């Protein structure tokens, strides 16, 4: 019923860039608003409280400003350790409410994924199930865009994606998309293809195989 809205959801930028995040609250908070920094698989840190008051340990490049409804956080010159997710938190009435957060990701040059397809193992086929895997390796940005096509026919709700966190060394991403089907239904079609469309490719790439 109190609603905290964060914008943008994801921002990509560069060591040394200036970056700024928005928190809108659907009712007058006044100025009871905190900001937290969370890195993957770790507890959040307090950074800013009461709109603009920095916590004890916090670098001065972190600034915060707002009152009433619109709130902002800015990192002036972005340092390598500052890439994290950021949460705003209304502290006016109970129940308390966090934002859905903004991820600050590192920016680099566009990188075309290398695409691979993997027919199911014969071992898996004895179980009575068929998984088909399509790997997208080392690319940037995370956007794309994988479509399954069996006997040339477009597919839906039959495949789950999963994606890695930015590589510590080259800032790239990797994505797997997995198409699961019963053995019976797998055995009804012949052509299985994933089509990948991504910024760094002129036109979509299509990998395919023929069952048997």
């Amino acid at each position: 019923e109190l609603q905290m809205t964060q914008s943008p959801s994801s921002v990509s930028a560069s060591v040394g860039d200036r970056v700024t995040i928005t928190c809108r609250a659907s009712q007058g908070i006044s100025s009871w608003l905190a900001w937290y920094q969370q890195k993957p698989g770790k507890a959040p840190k307090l950074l800013i409280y009461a709109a603009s008051s920095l916590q004890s340990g916090v670098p001065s490049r972190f600034s915060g400003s707002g009152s009433g409804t619109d709130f902002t956080l800015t990192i002036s010159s972005l340092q390598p350790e500052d890439f994290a997710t950021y949460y705003c938190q209304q502290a006016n009435s109970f129940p308390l409410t966090f934002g859905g957060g903004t991820k600050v990701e590192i920016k680099r040059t566009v990188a075309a994924p290398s695409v691979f397809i993997f027919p199911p193992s014969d071992e898996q086929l004895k179980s009575g199930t068929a998984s088909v895997v399509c790997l997208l390796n080392n690319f940037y940005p995370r956007e794309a865009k994988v479509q399954w096509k069996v006997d040339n026919a477009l597919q839906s709700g039959n495949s789950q994606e999963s994606v890695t966190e930015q590589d510590s060394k080259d800032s790239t991403y990797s994505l797997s998309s997995t198409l699961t089907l019963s053995k019976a239904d797998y055995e009804k079609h012949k052509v299985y293809a994933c089509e990948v469309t991504h910024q760094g490719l002129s036109s979509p790439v299509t990998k395919s195989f023929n069952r048997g």
Binding site: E1, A34, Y87, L96, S121, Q124, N137, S174, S176
Partner: protein, 215 residues
């Protein structure tokens, strides 16, 4: 050195109950109000509950009110969250947070415990089936139909770390998790050289090595 020390999560079936505990070190909990905040797999922070310094009240997020009871044993410098009437959507890492105020309530949280995973599921402990992802080429292992999280996978008993990717598990509709691990490797070596993925799932006491060779 100031820190909150959590304890007591795990795997529990719907309708059942779990109790989390949060112990202070190195200060007196007895002076500070306490928050719990949870985070569902790859979703965001969601505030759950707060108890005042002396335990007089007692605030709950809407999603949990009437199902969870926060409490305090000030003589153990410990804080408790009783989680009853559990539902799958309560699956998450749960964090106790100290409130900045104390002896009064600010509503902000300066010190955070390590987190506790809590999984609410009808699934039964089951170890993974491990299927080869046959093949500069790419190759991998598909670790399918296990519960609960987590699994760990290495390549060649940990000698291979260059260009491996182990993707976050997905929860399939069925209640089981699945995952693949991939490694890229020079194509001039497929038949020459060996590749083994090593998969461990402690809950089911299951170790599996699987050799991945071409066609």
């Amino acid at each position: 050195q100031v820190q909150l020390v959590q304890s007591g999560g795990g795997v529990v079936q719907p309708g059942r109950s779990l109790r989390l505990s949060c112990a202070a070190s190195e200060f007196t909990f007895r002076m500070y109000a306490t928050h719990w905040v949870r985070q569902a797999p790859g979703k965001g922070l969601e505030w759950v509950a707060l108890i005042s310094y002396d335990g007089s009240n007692k605030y709950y997020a809407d999603s949990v009110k009437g199902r969870f009871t926060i409490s305090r044993d000030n003589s153990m410098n410990t804080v408790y969250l009783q989680m009853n009437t559990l539902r799958p959507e309560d699956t998450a890492v749960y964090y106790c947070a100290r409130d900045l105020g104390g002896y009064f309530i600010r509503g902000i949280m300066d010190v955070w415990g390590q987190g506790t995973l809590v999984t609410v599921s009808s699934a039964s402990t089951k170890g993974p089936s491990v299927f080869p992802l046959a093949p500069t080429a790419a190759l991998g292992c598909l670790v399918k139909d296990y519960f609960p999280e987590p699994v760990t996978v290495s390549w060649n008993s940990g000698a291979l770390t260059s260009g491996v990717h182990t993707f976050p598990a997905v929860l399939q509709s069925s209640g089981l998790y699945s995952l693949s691990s991939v490694v890229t490797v020079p194509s001039s070596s497929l038949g020459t050289q060996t590749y083994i993925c090593n998969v461990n799932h402690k809950p089911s006491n299951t170790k599996v090595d699987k050799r991945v060779e071409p066609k």
